[PDB]
Design a protein around this ligand. Structure first.
Ligand code: FKS
Ligand code: FKS
Ligand code: K
Ligand code: K
Ligand code: NA
Ligand code: NA
Ligand code: ZN
Ligand code: ZN
Lengths: 341, 341
């Protein structure tokens, strides 16, 4: 398959992340892309191509325009306000707040944020657009008839909702890819989110839409980030009724249990009639992952890729999370081996 | 008038505040209380007494029990979870989230928080209870017939809502005082919030209650913290219809304009028939305040106190904000001079 990857991911090189009450170097840092790219090449996936640039036509169909305008100028406005650190939200529109949008940068950064650990830094918008472009070009390969492709997205995307950034995400790459496939002629698309964390952003985008089915396997939100979405009872509303399937799982979950949820999610997707599946691939389900509590082993990733590809419909694999250890590369490459085998 | 003050405020001595993307020493620091106490004594208000301790009977009528239980153990749980900094929320229940309460400390601190600049530190709960006690004893003096009293509360209270902390606030001292006056026999009480910031916490507590009228003068939430409440259109709901009056004002507002809103707020309170007024007094309206944009001068505080006391109804003055310079003490003492003169 083709691997789509932009060196412009490096424009997102934030100095800080709010973690454990401290400002520390971020878990989601450029070395992740370096390690993943090297490992996929080592596994024989060396058809690596930069994405063509894209404008906003596709992304405007999944994200709010005000939100995207906010991301475009957030850094400039923060710096102009005289703040000395990176741009980090403080006040949030929580229970029983006004729905009004503030006008100043501090109010707006909170309005448009779901998670304060994520700082906006110079280059973030440009990096996010390059990552979106990798997802779009991946989608275009699937629309053109390829049965597999890998979009090596960074920054990741699945915590970005209709109008909010957080969890290291700004533009929901998988959502944009799904939209691109619909725009190219698909009538029904699924997104299968196997990252350890719930894709709350993706769920938000498609919750009331019947053209996209969203399935997520993830740490129970009662005790895992993102904390406020991802319960099994959330199945969709309005036109999207019955098109969200959440599989929350608990501490220590191994493949023998996680794979049963995978099987079920694929049954759901097949019954929905997806013409293609966008896989939001995080490898933070790994037993060594520093911020996560599942216990998948490196061989399990091959099984996972094979099982998802046995759906018999085309796959776009879109990179999400997976942290800390160089094995993040091996684990992603193993999913691709399972898909390609 | 009696000044009620607890030395246990010092148990809240947090090391960090998230401001401008940095962790800096908090603005809401123990020295504020020292500066204020010294200035009130200097102005002749030297009848200073410690509050009697109180349990939870009054506060349970204005704050949610789960919220108070959370505050009682938050620090211990944060430390037990292995985090190295103070306890600072990251993920928040913002637009289109599940209403469910997480079980873990990271989920719960976000569930129960409206603003991430405020860290929970060891001693915070104990300090908050002492500050609440000062408000309760102040209220009891008014209930017993005194026409004025000053509760030198620290930490402050007016950003704490039914089930949320933030803005340096944990227990809404003014709300507890109002409830105490109702419990002692009043049928109608007003809270007049003259701190620069909107009392979003106080508004939340009484929004659907007809027994308390809430008026606030504050920086416009379109461009001032707390950003997500405080618009003039918010007038109450259900049983509380017509009992919230917000007076948002803009950059550079001087007393000649601010005092017009004060006059109107007092006219509203009089028409409501308040039997006493709890004044949420912050002096961050001062022209030198480091985080605020109003332009009151020190003499204006005497005018303010005189005008509020000309209501002819008993006042409990409850300390809120005011930062940076020892003149916060002069400014508070000047309000008391206007009340007592
Ligand atoms: N104590 C737990 C702290 C959790 N902090 C935020 C973790 C964000 C994870 C992001 C991701 O892996 O889901 C993505 F795919 F988006 F990259
Ligand atoms: N760039 C603006 C940063 C604002 N940060 C939070 C300010 C909280 C003010 C607290 C207060 O003064 O309203 C209280 F009365 F509660 F103490
Ligand atoms: K997931
Ligand atoms: K106010
Ligand atoms: Na849907
Ligand atoms: Na009310
Ligand atoms: Zn993840
Ligand atoms: Zn204030």
């Amino acid at each position: 398959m083709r691997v789509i990857f932009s060196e412009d991911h490096k424009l997102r090189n934030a100095k800080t992340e709010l973690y454990g009450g401290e400002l520390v170097p971020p878990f989601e840092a450029p070395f992740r892309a370096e390690w993943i790219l090297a490992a996929v090449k080592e596994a024989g996936f060396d058809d690596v191509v930069a994405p063509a640039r894209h404008g906003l036509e596709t992304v405007l169909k999944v994200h709010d325009a005000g939100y995207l305008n906010f991301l475009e100028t957030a850094w400039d406005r923060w710096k102009a306000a005289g703040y000395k650190g990176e741009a980090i939200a403080t006040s949030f529109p929580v229970r029983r707040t006004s729905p009004r949008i503030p006008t100043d940068i501090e109010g707006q950064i909170g309005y448009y944020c779901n998670a304060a650990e994520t700082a906006i830094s110079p280059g973030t918008w440009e990096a996010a657009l390059s990552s979106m472009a990798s997802a779009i070009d991946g989608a275009d390969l699937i629309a053109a008839g390829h049965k597999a492709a890998f979009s090596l997205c960074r920054p990741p995307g699945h915590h970005a909702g209709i109008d909010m950034f957080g969890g290291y995400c700004f533009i929901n790459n998988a959502a944009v890819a799904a939209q691109r496939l619909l725009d190219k002629g698909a009538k029904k698309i699924a997104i299968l989110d196997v990252d350890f964390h719930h894709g709350n952003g993706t769920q938000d985008i498609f919750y009331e839409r019947g053209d996209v089915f969203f399935a997520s396997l993830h740490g129970d939100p009662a005790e895992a980030f993102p904390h406020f979405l991802g319960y099994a009872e959330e199945t969709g509303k309005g036109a999207g009724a019955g098109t969200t399937a959440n599989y929350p799982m608990g501490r220590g979950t191994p493949y023998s249990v996680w794979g049963e949820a995978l099987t079920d999610s694929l049954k759901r997707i097949a019954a929905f009639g997806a013409e293609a599946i966008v896989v939001s691939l995080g490898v933070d389900t790994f037993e060594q992952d520093p911020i996560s509590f599942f216990k998948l082993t490196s061989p399990d990733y091959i099984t996972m890729g094979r099982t998802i590809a046995a759906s018999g419909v085309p796959l776009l694999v879109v990179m999400e999370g997976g942290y800390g250890v160089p094995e993040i590369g091996l684990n992603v490459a193993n999913v691709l081996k399972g898909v390609a085998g």
